[PDB]
């Protein structure tokens, strides 16, 4: 709206969707994308629009997507999603939390763009190394920390459930049969 | 204070200059621009010397809303400051009017042409609205003074409803009416080559203006009207004496049902636009209850007019008749759908009329850069 | 003989068979599949599965399967078992973009070069019908650009942004048979270094590789605008030829003795190699600009049955024509 | 701000049918 | 235009509604009004405290002193007649008018109302002009302060009369756009053979200056009219008084017309670049 | 005579610059930079370049794998002429969003500075860049060199005018 293009907020909900889905991306350094937002003009790029309008997106792009690392731009009180996550991890047992650092996994269509993965690494890191293990800059090579996110992301809920249905495809206790209800009512599975 | 600061207000239709402090603005010319079509660049003409001038090629070089052409508006402003005003450049303060939903590229052009080729100290860019809603405390109770209200900016290009709730516009909620003065004027023209003979082709704009002008009102239904003109046409039925621009041969013609059918077409924009049916009476309503749920009560009771075509006769009334029956049957609806046992409090409606209505942009200028404290707040030259 | 599919330019071009249909990508997120209906090229299907760029294609003819790579980190192997192509998912465990994509001469492996210092090589497992992957990474410093085969269906070699050109070997065990003795060494485990060049003080990007078809002899070219042939037979020997024109993007063997090259010069060249070790320039092969192609040329194949009888190549790139050439 | 102009401000029946 | 013109245009205007709105017969309104003009003046038009049949139109130099005492008041008594009146608080010299008792032909008045500042400053040129005249030489010069930062000088000899104007700039473009213009003006002299004389010194006084105390410096700069008696002669006086009055807003004028120029010849080059690029595409 | 080399040699030397591919980064995931501002691997950047014909005015030309930036200083002989460049530059690089291929800050010590990358390549042609910044180089000092005679010439007849009446 702060560059003399109107779109309202019902009718053209679906316009800027797409905008959103093709030119969008999360900054690894904000430093270095500022600079290339002040001092150079690779970062703007035209859409055209059904009507036969090309409108001018520029740095817009990596200001977008920072509500999530950075929840206060929209006036959400919290935390963020790199801190939520440290939060997360830090209030478990201490045996089973080295059973979690290793394996954290993404899902859904929220999680598609462009350094996501390469921005929370960095962000835990250096979360984990300014609250638990304050300086001594030696022992986070032994402090293994990893992120699983396949170029499949969208559809996770659907593949598990595709494997699920076919591992137990046979068997006659999984599924909650139509006689049940028929009686009971209610299930305890 | 040593020197008042300089107001000019561009329009498509229409330029306003002047002095701060001041009640009045000292000049009101239309917006042309006259050339010839070494030192030719400054033969040229501005304003009333441009109307009709016959070696000489005019145009507008403000359309819609927007700048067209920057090299004429440099000009213009370059014969806006050295004849009518008077004033040196190098020390004096100026208030710009922007359009609502300006770009940045257009917003810095105007910087540029100022800061580069004038050298003006200093240069504020305001919005229309807070401008407008400012005049409006004129003629208000003390009691009352707040920067909550809807404006409906009138005049020759588009109209424009915009909210601003605590000092600040809502970008969101803006909405445009495509219908002016413009659209009137063009709409009575053809009333008029319809039914009177004696209308020169040349002089059918001026005339259309004139009666436009002069006897114009709005009228609450449309059949008593025409009944009550044709039963007694002696009370209703006026005479117009205009000069012929050949031989001063006068002429006379009767202003008849074209009074009452110009203005109309606010509230029935489906008798001369045919893509668009909505009145103004629902476009204010869906644009209050589009914000903020806190602020729906105060925009009500502050709904201003600022423009040259809210000027005719009962404007208000009907707007605020209209928009008075289409909240009463929404609480109605509220209240039967949660039985009888609770009423809620009505909606008051208000919409105020001034004396200052045909410039309140230009008043609003004029008083907010009196102050002392105007002087903080500009863009100085060392910033650009 | 020129023909003008698209303004825009043509990513990558892939051939069947019989020389009927071709697979293209415009530059977007899509391949389309044009045949022949006469004498006049009309648009046949449409393939969108990817989300990012599509950079790589090949066609196995004998199995009629095309695979698909691109910037997205994904890949795809189509297959056509109704009127409509369907895909098949592909696990390639890489974190960066994919660059190249071959498949192999007996059409059950294909190896896939990306930028994250990797060399990816997929076969098939059926139990849950997929595709599996093996990396070679141990001396790869830098993203690979180039990738062939040799006739053997084990040795692979490699160009990459490190100024090196390498001959690796990509021995699985459970889908390949034992292979024999090669010039080039012995002992092939897999993900074994077999041979390394690139030493030429001032070297640069390498962006083409090929074998021959006695598979003993190498060639490749630079972005310092030198060709280079190696030739393993008489001994692990190099002769550099150091030309006067601009880089060249791709380099394809039509026989034992004469090498095709072409690039941003917009014009295919010949290079002849001697048997006594020695390159030596022969001539262009197509003497606004006064070139057929009017930008520069991203790709060069062989209409013909291959390096066995090759008479016929193909030519496309940046300026949206496709273009062959006859020898005779 | 808004106390500097208010400040300044001093200083300078057919229609129920 | 090219001339910068030497009247009043919201007094003429305002004037001339109130004149022929009072002799058509209505009532007439309230006007309370202020104006700046060139070089730091200040006007104001208004009712005298409540009655709306008189108007009273009131300047407000801040450097009128000196001009009182070369004898400014002789000529507002002999031009003006008896319009003058008791000044108002604050003011220098005003004029009243009344709506009544109204000559009947009204373009002289307004005309002459015009030219307030034009007879404010007449006197000492008058004074100065005199002396050619009568002879009477040996008389030291004059000082006159526009602004803060500048002065005219004005001192007659036995057979020319010269006055020097001080000119200060602020932006750096201007120093040396003012070199390119006012350079022209030396050799100008040369191009004709009727006309008055120019001459220029750059950041240092003159002779006659230099023994007085000026302002040295970077963007000061000294233009000395030389006229003869043959321009300042009873029957052309007006002429030349009306012209050398205003040299400072010509020329500042004309500065700031020129790169106002030269934006329109950068636009055309921006727009034949953008077309040329544009002629690469394939599309 | 003189400046027909020195276009001849800016000529070629550009030709042998503008060979680009494209390359996503191997640093941070699906992002494409240019890798001559953001430099994050020193294998990908080539040697930079420096053309010139007297001791003020030369061309400065920065190679990469999908990036190239050249950077001009002009001629300027006096101060009319050095504020009206300053001018000019500070003109067209305001409007750098439609001139594509234009920097909007210059590289310290330089006037006007250019930055090319593939998609510029692939959407216009090859050659036509080239011409097109050898056309710029002198229709600049062309333009300059007509502006000054027409201020020069603005003032006679604003003299002449004045003078003329008294
Ligand atoms: N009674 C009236 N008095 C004055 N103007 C009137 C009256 N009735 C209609 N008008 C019209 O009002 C318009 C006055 O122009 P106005 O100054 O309001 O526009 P503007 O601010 O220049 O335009 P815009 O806001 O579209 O840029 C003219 O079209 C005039 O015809
Ligand atoms: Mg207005």
Not at chain 2, 262 to 281: L, R
């Amino acid at each position: 709206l702060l560059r003399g293009y109107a779109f309202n907020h019902s009718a053209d909900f679906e316009t800027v969707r797409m905008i959103k889905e093709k030119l969008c991306y999360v900054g690894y350094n904000i430093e270095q994308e500022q600079k290339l937002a002040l001092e150079t003009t690779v970062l703007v790029e035209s859409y055209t629009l059904p009507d036969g309008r090309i409108i001018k997106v520029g740095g817009e792009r990596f200001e977008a997507p920072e509500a999530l690392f950075q929840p206060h731009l929209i006036n959400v009180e919290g935390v963020g999603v790199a801190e939520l996550l440290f939060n997360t991890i830090q209030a478990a047992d201490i045996d089973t939390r080295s059973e979690f650092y290793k394996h954290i996994v993404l899902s859904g269509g929220s999680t598609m763009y462009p350094g996501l993965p390469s921005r929370l690494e960095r962000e835990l890191k250096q979360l984990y190394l300014e609250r638990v293990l304050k300086g001594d800059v030696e022992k986070l090579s032994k402090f293994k920390i990893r992120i699983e996110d396949p170029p499949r992301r969208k559809h996770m809920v659907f593949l598990g459930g595709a494997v699920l249905a076919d591992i137990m495809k046979d068997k006659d206790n999984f599924w909650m049969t139509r006689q049940e209800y028929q009686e009971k009512g209610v299930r305890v599975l | 204070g040593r020197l008042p600061a300089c107001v000019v207000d561009c329009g498509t239709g229409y330029t306003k200059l002047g002095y701060a402090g001041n009640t009045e603005p000292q000049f009101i010319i239309p917006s042309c621009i006259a050339i010839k079509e070494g030192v030719d660049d400054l033969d040229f003409f501005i304003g009333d010397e441009a109307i009709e001038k016959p070696t000489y090629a005019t145009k507008w070089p403000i359309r819609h809303g927007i700048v067209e052409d920057w090299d004429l508006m440099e000009r213009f402003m370059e014969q806006v400051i050295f004849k009518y005003l008077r004033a040196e450049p190098e020390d004096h303060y100026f208030l710009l009017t922007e359009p609502p939903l300006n770009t940045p590229e257009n917003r810095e052009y105007t910087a540029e042409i100022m800061f580069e080729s004038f050298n003006v100290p200093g240069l504020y860019i305001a919005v229309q609205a807070v401008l407008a809603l400012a005049a409006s405390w004129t003629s208000r109770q003390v009691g009352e003074r707040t920067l909550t209200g809807t404006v409906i900016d009138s005049g020759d290009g588009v109209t424009h409803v915009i909210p601003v709730a605590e000092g600040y516009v809502i970008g969101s909620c803006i909405k445009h009416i495509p219908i002016a003065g413009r659209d009137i004027t063009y709409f009575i023209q053809q009333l008029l080559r319809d039914r009177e003979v004696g209308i020169p082709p040349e002089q059918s704009l001026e005339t259309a203006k004139a009666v436009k002008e002069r006897y114009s009102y709005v009228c609450p239904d449309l059949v008593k009207e025409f009944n009550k003109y044709d039963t007694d046409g002696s009370k209703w039925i006026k005479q117009y004496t205009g000069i012929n621009a050949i031989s001063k041969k006068e002429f006379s013609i009767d202003v008849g049902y074209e009074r009452f059918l110009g203005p109309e077409i606010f509230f029935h924009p489906e008798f001369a636009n045919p893509d668009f049916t909505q009145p103004i009476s629902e476009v204010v309503d869906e644009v209050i209850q589009n914000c903020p749920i806190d602020v729906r009560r105060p925009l009500y009771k502050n709904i201003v007019l600022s423009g040259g075509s809210t000027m005719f006769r009962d404007f208000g009334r009907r707007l605020q008749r209209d928009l008075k029956r289409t909240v009463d049957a929404r609480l109605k609806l509220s209240e039967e759908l949660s039985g009888g046992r609770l009423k809620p409090k009505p909606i008051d409606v208000q919409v105020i009329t001034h004396h200052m209505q045909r410039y309140a942009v230009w008043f609003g200028g004029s008083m907010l850069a009196s102050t002392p404290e105007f002087y903080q707040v500009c863009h100085t030259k060392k910033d650009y | 003989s020129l023909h003008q599919f698209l303004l825009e330019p043509i990513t990558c071009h892939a051939w069947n068979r019989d020389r009927t249909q071709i697979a293209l990508s415009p530059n977007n997120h899509e391949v389309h599949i044009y045949k022949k209906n006469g004498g006049q090229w009309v648009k046949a299907h449409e393939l969108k599965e990817h989300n990012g760029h599509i950079t790589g294609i090949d066609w196995a003819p004998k199995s009629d399967r095309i695979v698909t790579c691109g910037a997205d980190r994904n890949a795809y192997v189509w297959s056509q078992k109704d009127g409509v192509w369907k895909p098949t998912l592909v696990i390639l465990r890489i974190n960066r973009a994919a660059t190249f994509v071959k498949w192999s001469p007996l059409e059950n492996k294909f190896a896939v070069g990306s930028g994250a210092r990797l060399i990816s090589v997929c076969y098939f497992e059926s139990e849950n019908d997929w595709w599996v992957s093996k990396h070679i990474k141990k001396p790869i410093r830098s993203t690979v650009l180039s990738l062939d085969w040799h006739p053997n269906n084990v040795l692979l070699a490699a160009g990459s942004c490190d100024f090196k050109c390498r001959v690796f070997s990509a021995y699985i065990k459970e889908v390949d048979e034992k292979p024999a003795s090669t010039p080039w060494g012995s002992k092939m485990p897999f993900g074994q270094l077999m041979s390394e060049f690139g030493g030429s003080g001032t070297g640069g990007w390498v962006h083409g590789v090929s074998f021959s078809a006695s598979g003993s002899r190498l060639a490749w070219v630079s972005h310092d605008s030198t060709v280079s042939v190696a030739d393993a037979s008489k001994s692990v020997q190099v002769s550099t030829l150091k030309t006067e024109f601009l880089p060249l993007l791709s380099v394809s063997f039509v026989s034992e003795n004469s090498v095709v090259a072409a690039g941003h010069d917009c014009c295919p060249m010949l290079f002849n190699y001697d048997d006594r070790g020695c390159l030596t320039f022969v001539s262009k092969l197509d003497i606004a600009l006064e070139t057929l192609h009017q930008n520069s040329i991203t790709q060069v194949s062989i209409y013909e049955v291959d390096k066995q009888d090759c008479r016929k190549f193909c030519t496309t790139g940046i300026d949206g024509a496709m273009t062959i050439w006859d020898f005779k | 701000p808004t106390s500097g102009i208010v400040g300044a401000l001093m200083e300078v029946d057919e229609w129920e049918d | 235009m090219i001339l910068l013109e030497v009247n009043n245009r919201i007094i003429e205007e305002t004037l001339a509604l109130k004149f022929e709105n009072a002799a058509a017969g209505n009532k007439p309104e309230a006007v309370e009004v202020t104006f700046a003009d060139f070089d730091g003046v200040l006007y104001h038009i208004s009712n005298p405290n409540g009655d709306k049949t008189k108007v009273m139109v009131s300047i407000s130099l801040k450097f009128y002193k000196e001009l009182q005492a070369h004898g400014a008041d002789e000529l507002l008594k002999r031009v003006y007649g008896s319009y003058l009146v008791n000044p108002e608080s604050g003011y220098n010299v005003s004029l009243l008018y009344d709506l009544e008792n109204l000559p009947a032909s009204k373009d002289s008045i307004v005309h002459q109302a015009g030219m307030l500042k034009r007879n404010c400053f007449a006197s000492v040129f008058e004074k100065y002009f005199q002396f050619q005249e009568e002879g009477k030489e040996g008389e030291n010069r004059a000082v006159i302060h526009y602004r803060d930062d500048e002065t005219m000088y004005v001192e007659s000899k036995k057979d020319r009369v010269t006055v020097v104007f001080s000119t200060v700039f602020k932006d750096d473009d201007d120093v040396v756009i003012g070199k390119v213009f006012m350079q022209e003006f030396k050799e100008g002299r040369r191009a004709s053979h009727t006309a008055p004389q120019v001459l220029f010194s750059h950041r240092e006084p003159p002779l006659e200056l230099k023994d007085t105390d000026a302002a040295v410096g970077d963007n000061i700069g000294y233009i000395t009219f030389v006229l003869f008696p043959r321009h300042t002669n009873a029957s052309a006086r007006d002429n030349t008084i009306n012209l050398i009055h205003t040299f400072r807003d010509y020329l500042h004028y004309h500065i700031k017309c020129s790169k106002a120029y030269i934006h329109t010849r950068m636009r055309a080059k921006t727009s034949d670049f953008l077309k040329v690029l544009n002629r690469a595409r394939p599309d | 005579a003189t400046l027909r080399p020195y276009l001849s040699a800016v000529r070629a030397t550009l030709q042998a610059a503008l060979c680009l591919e494209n390359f996503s980064s191997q640093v941070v995931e699906r992002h494409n930079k240019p890798e001559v501002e953001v430099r994050s691997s020193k294998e990908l950047l080539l040697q930079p370049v420096t053309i010139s014909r007297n001791e003020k005015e030369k061309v400065l030309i920065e190679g990469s794998i999908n990036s190239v930036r050249v950077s001009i200083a002009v001629k300027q002989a006096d101060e009319i002429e050095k504020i009206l460049c300053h001018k000019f530059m500070r003109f067209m690089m305001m409007r750098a969003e439609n001139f594509f291929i234009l920097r909007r800050k210059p590289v310290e010590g330089y006037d006007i500075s250019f930055l090319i990358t593939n998609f510029h390549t692939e959407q216009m042609y090859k050659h036509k860049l080239v011409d097109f910044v050898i056309h710029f180089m002198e229709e600049i000092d062309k333009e300059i060199s007509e502006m000054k005679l027409s201020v020069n010439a603005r003032a006679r007849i604003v003299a002449e005018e004045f003078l003329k009446n008294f």
